[PDB]
Structure formats: C-alpha cells, structure tokens
Amino acid sequence: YMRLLLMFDMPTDTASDRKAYRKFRKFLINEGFIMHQFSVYSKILLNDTANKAMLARLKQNNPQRGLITLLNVTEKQFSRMIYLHGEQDNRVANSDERIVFLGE
Amino acid sequence: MSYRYMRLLLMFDMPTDTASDRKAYRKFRKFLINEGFIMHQFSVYSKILLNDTANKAMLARLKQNNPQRGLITLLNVTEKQFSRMIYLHGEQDNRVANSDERIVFLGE
Amino acid sequence: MGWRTVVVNKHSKLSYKNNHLVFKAIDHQELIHLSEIDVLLLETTDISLTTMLLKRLIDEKILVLFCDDKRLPIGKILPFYGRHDSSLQLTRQLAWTEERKGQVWTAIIAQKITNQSLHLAQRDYGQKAAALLAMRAELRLFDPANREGHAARSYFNTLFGNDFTREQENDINAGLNYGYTLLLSIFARELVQTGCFTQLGLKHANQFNDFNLASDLMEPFRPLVDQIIYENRKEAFPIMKRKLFALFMNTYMYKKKQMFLTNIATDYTKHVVKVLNQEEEGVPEFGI
Amino acid sequence: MGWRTVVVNKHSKLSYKNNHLVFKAIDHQELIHLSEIDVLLLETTDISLTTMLLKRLIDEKILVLFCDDKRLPIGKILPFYGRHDSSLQLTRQLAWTEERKGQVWTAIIAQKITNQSLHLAQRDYGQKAAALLAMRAELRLFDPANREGHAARSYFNTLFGNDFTREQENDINAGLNYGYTLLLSIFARELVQTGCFTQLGLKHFNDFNLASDLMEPFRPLVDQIIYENRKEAFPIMKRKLFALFMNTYMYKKKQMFLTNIATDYTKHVVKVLNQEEEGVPEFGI
Amino acid sequence: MGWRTVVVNKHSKLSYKNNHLVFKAIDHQELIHLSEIDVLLLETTDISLTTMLLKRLIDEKILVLFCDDKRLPIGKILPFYGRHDSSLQLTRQLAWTEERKGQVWTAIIAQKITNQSLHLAQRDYGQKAAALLAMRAEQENDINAGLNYGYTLLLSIFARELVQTGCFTQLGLKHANQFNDFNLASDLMEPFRPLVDQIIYENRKEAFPIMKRKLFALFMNTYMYKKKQMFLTNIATDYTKHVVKVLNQEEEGVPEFGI
Amino acid sequence: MGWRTVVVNKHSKLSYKNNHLVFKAIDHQELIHLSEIDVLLLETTDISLTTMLLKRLIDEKILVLFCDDKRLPIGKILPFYGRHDSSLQLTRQLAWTEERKGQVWTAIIAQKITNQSLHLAQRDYGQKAAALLAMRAELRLFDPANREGHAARSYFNTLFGNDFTREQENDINAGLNYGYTLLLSIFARELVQTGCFTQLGLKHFNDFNLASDLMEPFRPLVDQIIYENRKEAFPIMKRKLFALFMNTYMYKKKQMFLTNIATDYTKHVVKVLNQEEEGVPEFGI
DNA sequence: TCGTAGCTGAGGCCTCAGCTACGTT
DNA sequence: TCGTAGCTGAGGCCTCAGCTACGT
Ligand SMILES: [Mg+2]
Ligand SMILES: [Mg+2]
C-alpha cells in the first residue's frame, strides 16, 4: 500500500525540450499521477506488482532530459504530510479509501 | 520503519506576485539554507535528521519561521527509502552533506 | 485491477477523459483513474453519463450498477465478451456433464449450510447449528429432499424469530435482498470474465432468470450479508445499506490468507470453473 | 411492450419525460413512447443519457445494447428483476443441432459462391463464373472438400489477376477488409438483438464468428465496390464503401436498404436454426 | 550534539557561510552544516582557514585539532568560556575539598586498572589480569606512537567537555597543573585508555598509518555505558558532567565506565 | 622565548616562510621572526591563516588568542606537549589575597573618582569637582559606604542635568555604554594575555568583571567625548569615540596611545595583585 | 450533447550572480 | 584576504486556457 513520488526539473531551452516535457507530463496524467505541487507528482500504487509495472512503463516513456527522480513513500507516511501552510488536496484520487461517495 | 538517519522532505510553491511575497520567500529560503537543508530539486529541499527528537525540534523551528504564504509541505522519508531514490534521468548529488557517514575525508 | 467502490448520488454529469472517470456537479468536480475503480454504483436518477465512458468502463472490467428512485439496485451492465478468447471456455461450459454439475452444485450448497451453521454457533445457538450439520450430512446429488430449504427455514427462524419468513416486506428482508444483489453482481461479473454465461445455473439452467449461475456460485457467501444484517437488525434500512458496503472494505479468511471479497470471488469463481471443466478435482472452499 | 428497434448513432442526448424517450439535439429532436419500444441500441460513443431514463427503460423490460467505437456490441443492461424476450433465444441457440447448423451454414456459403459467380458474370467472365456454379453444385455438409476456398481463389484471381492473393498487403485488400468489417459489425448487431451470442460460428479465436458466418453472402457487395475502385487510393475506396449504407439492394422482391435486409435476413436465419421455419432466406446480388 | 568527524588532508581553504563550513580545493568544493559536526581535524599544513570560521567553530562547541607535518596532533582550540554562566562552576571548583578530590581520583584510577584487567582477560591472560585486581584493593616504536596518538584524542575530548561544564582543565585532582595545562582532562580520561589499548593491540602488527585510521573507530563505534550502547563523545559528556557533580558534592557516587 | 605581542586587526592573510610570520594586507606587507614573538592576538574575524603557520606557532610555544566579532577573546590554542609562560599566572591569581584585592580595587576606584573630578574641573565646575575629592577621601576597603555611586550620581548630574539618570534610555547613555564596551574589550584582551581569567572581579554574572574593574579609571575618557558630542545623534557619537584608538594620553611621563597604556597598566596591576610589586599604577586624565 | 493529440503565449514560480550598506549596549 | 542583510534583473522552470487538426 504505497505512493510513488515523482519529481522533475526539465529543460525548456529549446522546442524539442519543451515537446519532450509536454509528452512526458501527458504520460503522467494519463497514468493517473496527481500534481501535488508544480514539478511534483504522486501516483497511488496498490502493491509491488503495480509498482515494478509502473517503473517499467516510466522507463519506456523516459524523455532523456533533465532531472527526473522517484521515491517510494508508504501510505502512512504520505497521509501524515504536514501542511506547514496552505491546505490539503481533498480530491478522492488523493485518498486511499476503499469506498467513495460523490456527495453523500 | 527505522527513521534513524531519516530525511525530511520539504516542498513549496510560494507566490512571487508582490514584493512582500518575494521578501517572505527569500527569508524562508534563507532559513532553510541556514538550517542545513539541501536543494535536491527546485522547489524541493531535504534535511538529514538524526532521530525523531531532532525532527520534532526542526518542525517547531519551521513553524516559528513560517512565512504564511503559499503551499508548504513536509514528508518524512526513511534513509532506506531516500538512498533507494530511483534516478529516472540525471545523476546523484555526491556532496558529503548528502551522505550519513560519521567519518568524512576531504581527500583521503 | 482496482479497489475503489465509487458511489454517485448528486445531480451530476459523468464523462471520460485520459483514463479517468470525470464527475461534474455544480459545486465541484472530481477525476478518478479507472485503474483504481472496482465498482461504480449509480444510486440516483439525477445522474447523466456518456456512452464513451460506458465503453471504457466495460474495457476495464468495472462493475456498473443502476438503481431506481428508492435507491435500490435494479440492474447491471453485462458485458458480452472477455477475457478474450472467451470462446474456449464457452465450448467447455456447454460440455459440462450433468453428473459433474451435480457434484459441484451440491458441494457448494453444502458450504452454504455449513456457513449458516457457523453463523448460528457464533450467536450462541450451539444446538440449532448442530441440527443444520445433520441436514448437510443427508444431502444427495441436486438435493432432491430440499435440505437446503429446511436448513434455510430453521436458520432464519432461529436468527429472527418463528414469526419471521423470508417473505416479506420488512426492513430485515429488504437489506438481506440488497446484500444478495451485491453478491450476485460480483459473481456475475467474475463468471463472464472467465468466459462463461451467467444464464445457465448448474441445477436449473436459465429457467427462472438470466443470472442463475452467479446465484449458484454466491451461495456460500450469503451468510456474510446475513451477519451484517443480523447485527443491524434493529436499525432503519438506510443504515443497513451502508453497513453492507463493509463487504467491499472488510477482509475475510480464504485459502489461509486474509483477502478482500472481490479478490476471493475471482479466485473462487475461476477455480470452481476449472473443476466444472474437469481440469481439477476439488471445489474451493469458503468458510466464515 | 413494444415493437420498435430504436437505433441511435448521432451525437445526442437521451432523457425521459412522460412515458417517452426524449432524443435531442439540433438539427434533430424526437419523442418516442416507451410502450412502443422493444429495443434501444446505442451504436456510438457520441451519445449521452440519464439514469432516470435507464431506470424507466428497465421498468418497461426494454433491451438496451451498448457498443464500442467500431460500432460492435459489447454489452447490455441486465435487470435483476424480470427479463426481455430475447433471453428465450439463448436456450434455443444452445439447442441448435449439429446437423442443422450444417444445413444452414452450407446453404449460406452456397449463396456466397452464387453471388461471387454473378459478380464475375457481371464483369463479362461468363466462363469463370459458370465454373463457380459447378463448385457450388458439389458442396456437401460443412464443405469438407473446401469448394468455398477454391471458388474464392479462382474468383479473386479472375477479378484482380493471377499474381493476386488475399494475403498480400496492398490497397485492394485493405479496402476489402475495411468493407468486410463494416458488414461484420452490422450482423453482429442484429444477431445480438435477436438474443444470440456472436462468439460461436455454425462451423467449428474470434468473438464474432456467427456474424462472420451470416454476412458471407453479402461479401460480394464490397467486392463490387472495391473492384470498381481498384485503381484508386485507399481513402477513396473507404468513402465509396459508405455506399452500402445509402444504396438500395434487391431482397425478397423489394428494393431495401442494407441494414433493413440484414435485420430480416438475420432474424429469419435464426428462425430456421431454431427449427421454427424451413428454408433459409436468400440474398442475391 | 553533532556527529561528524571531518578530516581535512587536501590543499584547501576553509570558510564560513550560512551556518556551514565551506571547503574549497581543486576542483572539489564542499559545504557541511556546523550542527552536524562533532570534530574538525586539520591533518596537514597545506590548509588555510578564517578567524570567522574559527569563532563559529567555538560557538558550536566543536573540537578543533591541529597537526604537524608528520600528521600528528600537536594542539587544539581551547575556548575560555564553555557555558552560561560558567562562573558559577568556577567558584565551586576552587572549593573542591582535598579529601574529595582524593576519593574521586582514586575511584577513577581504580576503574582504569579494572579495565586494564578486563582487557587482559579478554586476551586470555586470566592470570596476569587477576593480579591487577589484587593491586586495585591495594621504546620509541610504532606501538607507542599509536597509543600516544589515541590518548591525545581521548584527551582533547575530555578537555572539551570539562571546559563546557565551566571548569578549568589546568587543575588535576592529584597534580593541579604542576606538569600540564590539561591534567584534569588527563585525569578524567583514565578509565577510557584501554579503548585505545584494544585497538592498538589488535593492529600491533601494522604500520603506524594503519593504526591511526583504525583509531578513528572511537568516534564511530558504540560502547556499553549506563546500560545503553552510546557513542564515545556522548559518554564523555555524561561521564564528565556527572563526575563534576560529585566533586561539587551535589551527589554521591562517581559514574562508571567499564570495557 | 620572545618579547613581541603581535596584534592583528586588518583584513589580512597570515603565512609562514623561513622562521617568519608573514602578514599580507591590500597594500601593507610585513615579516616578523617567530623567535621575536611572545604572543599573537587575532583581534578580528577578517583574518585568514594557514595550518603550516599554526604548527610553527605551536613549535615555538607562542600564545595564540582568538577573538569574537566584538573583539573580545574567546579562546586560545592549547598545545598538548609544552606550555607558554602565561600558564603560571593562573596559579598566582587563585592565590590573590582578599585583603589585597581590596587594596587594589579601592585604589583603582579612587583613581576613577579623581578623574571624574578632573573632568568636572575641566568644564568649569571647580565646586562640584572638589566635592568628589571629599568623597574619595572617605573611601574604605571595598567602598561599603558606596561613595563610588554618590560620586557617579553627582558627576553625571552636573554634566548632563538633574533630570539625567544613567538608567534612562537616551542617546547620551547609548554612547556612554558603547564607549565602555570598547574599553572593556581592550582590558579583557590585555588581561587574558597576562595569563589571567577575566570572569571574576576583585570585588565579589559577567564573563568580564575583572576587565570591568581595571577599566574603571579610563571611563572618563569616554565621558569627555560624549559630553562634547552630547548634542549629536548616536551615529556621530559612535564615530567620535574612535578617537580613543587615535588620540594620545598622558601616562607615566609620556604621551602614549590608549592600547599601549592599557597593556602597561594591566601587566603592572597584575604584578601588584601577585605581590611582586607594591603600588598600583596611575592613570589620570 | 463524444473523444484524442499537439502547440502557443500569457503569466506565475524559482535560482543565482552581482551590487550596496554595514560592522564592539 | 572576513562576514551579514536586503534588493535587483537575467534567465530558466512550469502550468494552463484557448486554439487547431483530427477521428471506421
Ligand atoms: Mg521542480
Ligand atoms: Mg514547487
């Protein structure tokens, strides 16, 4: 039960660089990553198989640019995120709860 | 699990709109550097902490120097996790500041 | 694939975009990645959705449930195909021997009675419970003596009183039925995935309905609803309905591991289907 | 309970009002009373509909079918309480005798060969055409001698040259295949409507063998169009192929549109497979 | 409470910036946060540093060691003021009774001889070891060079801790600065000497440079003290602060270190 | 083993070459032979030095002192092997008799009162000045009657008005205190050089009471400068106070610079506190 | 009232080299 | 050849509303 934390700093210098970024960022959205903060994304992943799978997919869609970096946080750790200022993203996509209501 | 040489991960998005906003940021970022945080990536900093007590201490200091702007967010990663950081592209920062080893040579 | 049970009950508009379900209501909007979704329950009549979304919901084998204006379930999406090539399993299902169907159905109804008994024991009816094991022992192929129904009567009498009958028209039955429909839709899904038709029950084929086979496979799991409803037998219907979603959250002992209900159902179903094809010899077991 | 099979394939919004299905929007609007509806087929991914309507569609035990982006059926609504009358056809399909499947399949294949021949004759190959009739006459149950394939070879050779094979990767085959997929999706649709499963053909992979089997005699309709445009680029064949949905074709003595034919043909073939009728319906070109 | 022992060997310039030590060479550059630093060892004569940095190194009570051209230690920074108000402990140290200094010094020297014995026993001299316990109820080579290096390390540690408590290191409990400016540190470190003896014994076969490295173990290893595994400098702090208490007569009973 | 006390306070770089200390600043460069050096005092935070030099400074047992940014001493190099001769002064300071500390402290306080009086006379208060001499004459060991404080009150009243108190928060006091801190750091420095500890004054919270005690007679030097600029803003008093480091003052029979006086005064006071001499040295304004 | 992919330009986020003013209640 | 605090402007990072071209 985990959260993959993906962090990039990618170049914008040239139009190939930018294209590569837009492609990559698309891949991320399609893959169900949530922007927590600019340049910083998180995908909730269920178990080990999902992870090794996701990592392989990332490697295939690697835009060989910039600094792109991944961390594996446990759900426990990620939900304990201290908000020094500003408030939490309450989208359901960002929780780990089994049952979900769209307005009860 | 351990947190022994844990790593606090600090992530901000702070407004630049007005000069008070910018001042607040520079103050905050200074606090961070002075407190021994390392820029891993642009809006993203990490401070190695020795144990949990050091953390609760650091958290209290952060709260006191809170700029009251933007989205500022903290996560506790275990040493194990942080050293397993997968570098999808680009390469690691080999500063001593970024290792956890007690004995350090400046050219051995 | 997934784990989320997504319940919708606000006036809203569901769409699809980039592998996400898209929910839009006046106050707010939400995006949820399909790979995270196990079940989509459309509780109300104020919801509007697109055929695009429904295609995709079928692709990712998501259980979709529709409800009436009293928020009771009245139907499901039934995909025609898949896993591909489902054809293989079809030709095998048609080949299922009458004798074997019997062994399996009876083995399964036996697990139910057992679980009914365990449930009674769990409520300190050591006696009535032991009586149901007696009935189990007297089962013959396809239960021509209807021990199933006798067990069922005694079971419910002991749990809810001698006045109680499964018919009709109280809160307790309404909840029991809601629950059973949930179980039904789960196994219906899994069966179709294996390449079977849910129309064909092991004992009655499709004489009475289009989902008998799901109805047959879910038998041993019925007491899971019985437990929840018994515990909330004092409550109003809306509270039973909610407490029943526990089935999708809780974890249950199965093959020596604590597993989630839908995962169990998948294994159980796929494995039952194997022993019906005669690729294997011992029906899998669910106990409570 | 009704009679209408309501097919939707325009970008639209379905709703419910006063016992009517409500279909919008501009250019076109329409109201249809639910008591008149037997089946609602949602052919495309363009449509949007309401849970209110779906509740009511379930109340009146209307068969609701969904399709994918290639307009093939992929599922239906399954009510928990009650049943549409297509359910009955399943029990019958499972009962289809091996002998009868044979008679029907062979009868159908025979119509194909005939139509292949007529097509050849129409291109002034009086000779090669007559040869295919010879092959037709030598058909036995389930064509174990594979006259079908021989007819097919000769047919295509005469039309597109001895160098031509149907395996080879060119514009002509691409169009032929596009056209056949169109025919497939049509019959797939109709079969499911009748309450059948498309997955198992009369002669035995594919999820649509049975559609593949029923559409056999209609193949030459594509063959004609492609032959006529054999000189053109693929995109032009693709467009000229939409003719199938516009043109009208001789069937049961009346000029009818292709989908109407398919509906009759299918529903009637299914009858003779159930043994409620004798005599397969005929399509000629 | 810092933990890093930072050893410098390369021609370089040390600076201070934003609570960091700043190290600059060819083309190696490095920043280290002072709060992480326990000890700074300046091994060579090719290093240049600033009085700013040294002020800050004294503020954060970091042990700074200097070496000669053979890379042996020859001195350390001795702060004058090691707490707030250190004056309080000074007036108490001057009040230390001759009788009590005796009890404490003897108690400490006893711990040493015990630990020497335990060390002998650990090398299977059950006999000679037992002989040293009897005493308790009553040249110019690589081995000594290492022993002395090690003892200087221990000395600088306790010197530091003593000053922090507000004491003067000059005044030994028996000998009160007659021979040394650090007799009191020399006195407190006595029971810890065998820690060096062990390391040197184990490497008695090796060349001096290998003994020197193996000795840094003291700053990394952990040792049994008051029932807990602790790092050497943390022990030294507790041990020292607690010894000072029993000399002021704010408690009874010298703390104990065993090996 | 040497005689020079070498004070550094300019932004600079210290090196070693051929038995010399090497001093380099923007323009100024200077070489000094180590055998001539008794003490090296690093007064400021702008200085850079080498471990080579420090090794050699330890070899020749030179006393090396470091300071903080207020130019007060905070530590020294402690060699492991030998000893500079300032070590000996510690054992002597601990031996300072209570009776003698009294004689010296009182003698010193008396010089202060005298200088306060001379300052008043210099401002044409012949009268109030003579009154302070009366107070001086009534001093006893350790001033239990607090004539010091009475002299101080009257002194400041006459100079800055009867509404003036030294506890009030104004520009005049801010400058007076700045000035006194300057004097303090000077004597703190000199005391440590002699081998003493600054922490404990002759008469008993501060880490520098003893410096505070020795600087007493020099206080009026600040009082003069501030009085003269009592009309000005604080920043102007601060600058005019640097005069202390430039001006020359009568001491012994010679015009000397302040720090040179402080060095002599301090070393000599320390001598009479060790009882190697009789007769406290005198500073008059 | 169905989806996709890809680019642009406006506008906010973020760091760093380089400059000025300052330096013992 | 020592530091700080505070601001600026050059220049790269990052997202998003809005548009075009497209799709059995
Ligand atoms: Mg970034
Ligand atoms: Mg950021």
Question: What resolution in angstroms does the PDB record give?
Answer: 3.2
| C-alpha span between D48 and D52 (Å, rounded) | 12
Burial of F62 per CB tally in 10 Å (0-12, 13-18, 19+): buried
- C15: β partners: C22
Sign of the alpha-carbon dihedral angle for C184, C186, C188, C194: negative
Is the Cβ of D45 closer than 8 Å to some Cβ of chain C?
A: yes
C17: three-class secondary structure by DSSP: strand
Ligand nearest to the CA of B10: 2
The CA R_g of chain A, rounded to the nearest whole Å, is 15
Backbone angles phi, psi at C163, to 5 degrees: -65, -25
Nucleotides of G under 7 A from a protein CB: 1-8, 12-16, 23-25
Nearest residue to C37 via CA among C8, C13, C63: C63
CB C258 within 8 A of CB C265: no
CB D214 within 8 A of CB D266: yes
Neighbours of chain A (3+ CB pairs under 8 A): B, C
**What's the CA A91/C1' H16 distance, rounded, in angstroms?**
19
- Give residue C146's identity as a one-letter amino acid code: N
Nearest residue to C3 via CA among C41, C36, C42: C36
Q: What is the distance in A from the centroid of ligand 1 to the CA of A65? A: 13
DSSP string over chain D: ---EEEEE-SSEEEEEETTEEEEEETTEEEEEEGGGEEEEEE-SSSEEEEHHHHHHHHHTT-EEEEE-TTS-EEEEEEESS---TTHHHHHHHHT--HHHHHHHHHHHHHHHHHHHHHHHHHTT-HHHHHHHHHHHHT--TT-TT-HHHHHHHHHHHHHH-TT--SSS-SHHHHHHHHHHHHHHHHHHHHHHHTT--TTS-S----S-HHHHHHTGGGHHHHHHHHHHTTTS-HHHHHHHTTHHHHSEEEETTEEEEHHHHHHHHHHHHHHHHHTSS-S------
What residues does each domain of chain F span?
1-81, 82-285
CB E60 within 8 A of CB E35: yes
Backbone angles phi, psi at D10, to 5 degrees: -100, 145
- Which helix (H) or strand (E) covers residue E44, if one does? none
Six token digits for residue B68: 């009251």
**What's the CA F177/C1' G25 distance, rounded, in angstroms?**
5
Residue B3 Cα to chain centre, angstroms: 15
The CA R_g of chain E, rounded to the nearest whole Å, is 19
Six token digits for residue C192: 């179709």
C212: three-class secondary structure by DSSP: helix
| C-alpha span between E15 and E31 (Å, rounded) | 10
Is the Cβ of E127 closer than 8 Å to some Cβ of chain F?
A: no
Q: What is the dihedral of CA E104, E106, E109, E114, to 10 degrees?
A: -110
Question: Residue D163 contacts by C-beta under 8 Å, 6 or more apart in sequence?
Answer: none
Six token digits for residue F19: 């038995």
Nearest residue to E146 via CA among E210, E223, E54: E210
Sign of the alpha-carbon dihedral angle for D23, D28, D33, D38: negative
| C-alpha span between F91 and E177 (Å, rounded) | 8
Nearest residue to C50 via CA among C22, C27, C31, C72: C22
| C-alpha span between D240 and D230 (Å, rounded) | 11
Question: Residue F277 contacts by C-beta under 8 Å, 6 or more apart in sequence?
Answer: F268, F271
Q: How many CB atoms lie within 10 A of CB D163?
A: 7
Six token digits for residue D32: 């249809």
A contact set with B (CB within 8 A)? 5-9, 36-40, 55, 58-59, 62-73, 77-78, 80-86
Sign of the alpha-carbon dihedral angle for F96, F102, F105, F107: negative
CB nearest D74 (choices: C42, C45, C55): C55
Nearest DNA or RNA nucleotide to F46 (CA to C1'): H2
DSSP classification of residue E177: S
The CA-atom distances, in angstroms, between C116 and each of C107, C264, D184 are: 14, 19, 50
Backbone angles phi, psi at B33, to 5 degrees: -70, -50
Strands of chain C (E only): list them. Answer: 4-8, 12-17, 20-24, 29-33, 37-42, 47-50, 63-67, 73-79, 251-254, 257-260
Q: How many CB atoms lie within 10 A of CB C144?
A: 8
CB nearest C80 (choices: D73, D79, D81): D73
- C257: β partners: C254
Please give the biggest Cα pair distance in chain C: 60
E173: three-class secondary structure by DSSP: coil
Six token digits for residue D261: 């034919």
Q: What's the CA angle centered on D149, arms D148 and D154, to 5 degrees? A: 105
CB C46 within 8 A of CB C10: yes
Interchain CB distance below 8 Å, B71 and A7: no
DSSP classification of residue C199: T
**What's the CA E158/C1' H16 distance, rounded, in angstroms?**
62
| C-alpha span between D285 and C62 (Å, rounded) | 44
CB D32 within 8 A of CB D2: no
Prior bond to D136 cis, omega within 30?
A: no
Six token digits for residue F174: 């801010």
E85: three-class secondary structure by DSSP: coil
C165: three-class secondary structure by DSSP: coil
Q: What is the distance in A from the centroid of ligand 2 to the CA of B95? A: 23
Interchain CB distance below 8 Å, C31 and A93: yes
Question: What is the pairing mode between strands F12-17 and F47-50?
Answer: parallel
Six token digits for residue D38: 């037997």
Six token digits for residue B9: 């991960």
Sheet of A82-85: strands edge to edge? A82-85, B71-77, B7-13, B44-48, B38-41
CB F220 within 8 A of CB F118: yes
CB nearest E19 (choices: B34, B102, B104): B34
**What's the CA B42/C1' G13 distance, rounded, in angstroms?**
10
| C-alpha span between D193 and D196 (Å, rounded) | 7
CB B36 within 8 A of CB E36: yes
| C-alpha span between C43 and E186 (Å, rounded) | 82
Nearest DNA or RNA nucleotide to F234 (CA to C1'): G25
**What's the CA E209/C1' G5 distance, rounded, in angstroms?**
66
C154: three-class secondary structure by DSSP: helix
CB B80 within 8 A of CB A77: no
Minimal CA separation from E90 to chain B, in Å: 32
Six token digits for residue E185: 């540190």
Six token digits for residue C60: 């990712």
What approach was used to elucidate this structure?
Answer: X-ray
| C-alpha span between E164 and E62 (Å, rounded) | 11
CB D166 within 8 A of CB D154: no
| C-alpha span between A70 and C135 (Å, rounded) | 59
Sign of the alpha-carbon dihedral angle for E129, E135, E140, E142: positive
Length reported for chain A: 104
- Count how many pairs of residues, chain A against chain B, have C-beta atoms within 8 Å: 99
Q: Which of E80, E87, E177 to mutate to test the interface with F (most CBs of F within 10 A)?
A: E80
Question: What is the pairing mode between strands C37-42 and C63-67?
Answer: parallel
| C-alpha span between B77 and D142 (Å, rounded) | 69
- D185: β partners: none
Q: What is the dihedral of CA E107, E108, E112, E115, to 10 degrees?
A: 70
Is the Cβ of C24 closer than 8 Å to some Cβ of chain A?
A: no
CB E78 within 8 A of CB F75: yes
Sign of the alpha-carbon dihedral angle for F146, F148, F153, F158: positive
- Name the residue closest to the C1' of G15 by its CA: B42
| C-alpha span between E166 and E38 (Å, rounded) | 19
Burial D98-119 (b: 16+ CB within 10 A, else e): eeebbbbbbbbbbbbbbbbbbb
Six token digits for residue E199: 């390391």
Burial F200-214 (b: 16+ CB within 10 A, else e): bbbbeeebbbbbbbb
- Name the residue closest to the C1' of H15 by its CA: A38
Half-sphere exposure of F273 (CA within 13 A, CB side): 31
- Which helix (H) or strand (E) covers residue A61, if one does? none
Backbone angles phi, psi at D241, to 5 degrees: -75, -20
Contact: chain A with chain B (3+ CB pairs below 8 Å): yes
Q: Which residues of A touch B66 (CB under 8 A)?
A: 84-85
Nearest DNA or RNA nucleotide to A35 (CA to C1'): H15
| C-alpha span between E189 and E179 (Å, rounded) | 17
For E15, name the nearest residue in chain F, comparing CA atoms only.
F48
Is the Cβ of E20 closer than 8 Å to some Cβ of chain B?
A: yes
Q: Which of residues 76 through 95 in chain C touch D, CB cutoff 8 A?
A: 76-82, 84-88, 90-91, 94
The CA-atom distances, in angstroms, between A57 and each of A35, A50, A54 are: 19, 10, 5
Question: What is the pairing mode between strands C4-8 and B103-106?
Answer: unpaired
Interchain CB distance below 8 Å, E220 and B102: yes
| C-alpha span between C14 and F19 (Å, rounded) | 88
Minimal CA separation from B29 to chain E, in Å: 12
Minimal CA separation from A30 to chain B, in Å: 18
SS (H, E, C) F232-259: CCHHHHHHHCCHHHHCEEEECCEEEEHH
Question: Residue C206 contacts by C-beta under 8 Å, 6 or more apart in sequence?
Answer: C199, C200, C212, D87, D90, D91
| C-alpha span between D145 and D143 (Å, rounded) | 5
Q: What is the distance in A from the centroid of ligand 2 to the CA of A94? A: 18
| C-alpha span between C279 and C273 (Å, rounded) | 9
Interchain CB distance below 8 Å, D52 and C45: yes
Length reported for chain C: 288
Nucleotides of H under 7 A from a protein CB: 1-8, 12-16, 23-24
CB F66 within 8 A of CB F14: no
| C-alpha span between D105 and D94 (Å, rounded) | 16
Question: Residue E38 contacts by C-beta under 8 Å, 6 or more apart in sequence?
Answer: E2, E3, E4, E5, E62, E63, E219, E233
**What's the CA B64/C1' H5 distance, rounded, in angstroms?**
20
Interchain CB distance below 8 Å, A36 and B11: yes
- Which helix (H) or strand (E) covers residue E128, if one does? helix E126-137
- Give residue F109's identity as a one-letter amino acid code: I
- Name the residue closest to the C1' of H24 by its CA: D70
Burial of F15 per CB tally in 10 Å (0-12, 13-18, 19+): middle
Neighbours of chain D (3+ CB pairs under 8 A): C
- Count how many pairs of residues, chain E against chain F, have C-beta atoms within 8 Å: 126
DSSP string over E92-112: HHHT--HHHHHHHHHHHHHHH
CB C14 within 8 A of CB C49: yes
Nearest residue to C165 via CA among C178, C180, C154, C181: C154
Six token digits for residue F242: 């640097």
CB nearest A103 (choices: C4, C9, C35): C9
| C-alpha span between F198 and B99 (Å, rounded) | 42
| C-alpha span between B1 and A97 (Å, rounded) | 23
The CA R_g of chain C, rounded to the nearest whole Å, is 20
Interchain CB distance below 8 Å, C48 and D48: yes
Q: How far is the first Cα of chain E from the last one, in angstroms, to the nearest whole number? A: 23
Question: Residue A23 contacts by C-beta under 8 Å, 6 or more apart in sequence?
Answer: A61, A63
SS (H, E, C) chain F: CCCEEEEECCCEEEEEECCEEEEECCCCEEEEEHHHEEEEEECCCCEEEEHHHHHHHHHCCCEEEEECCCCCEEEEEEECCCCCCCHHHHHHHHCCCHHHHHHHHHHHHHHHHHHHHHHHHHCCCHHHHHHHHHHHHCCCCCCCCCHHHHHHHHHHHHHHCCCCCCCCCCHHHHHHHHHHHHHHHHHHHHHHHCCCCCCCCCCCCCCCHHHHHHCHHHHHHHHHHHHHCCCCCHHHHHHHCCHHHHCEEEECCEEEEHHHHHHHHHHHHHHHHHCCCCCCCCCCC
Six token digits for residue E179: 């021979």
Only one residue has tokens 């700029």, namely B67
SS (H, E, C) B33-76: HHCCCEEEECCEEEEECCCHHHHHHHHHHHHHCCCCCCEEEEEE
For E220, name the nearest residue in chain B, comparing CA atoms only.
B102
Only one residue has tokens 């199965």, namely C254
| C-alpha span between C213 and C276 (Å, rounded) | 12
Q: What is the distance in A from the centroid of ligand 2 to the CA of B41? A: 9
Q: What is the distance in A from the centroid of ligand 1 to the CA of A18? A: 15
Which residues in chain E have their C atom more than 2.5 Å from the N of the next written residue, marking a break after them?
138
Strands of E25-116 (E only): list them. Answer: 29-33, 37-42, 47-50, 63-67, 73-79
CB F227 within 8 A of CB F118: no
Nearest DNA or RNA nucleotide to D28 (CA to C1'): G1
- D50: β partners: C48
Residues measured by CB to lie within 5 Å of ligand 1, the ion: A 9, 39; B 41-42
Interchain CB distance below 8 Å, E19 and B48: no
Six token digits for residue F106: 């009182």
Length reported for chain D: 285
Q: Which residues of E touch F71 (CB under 8 A)?
A: none
CB nearest A9 (choices: B42, B67, B84): B42
Question: Residue C182 contacts by C-beta under 8 Å, 6 or more apart in sequence?
Answer: C73, C225, C244, C247
CB D112 within 8 A of CB D120: no
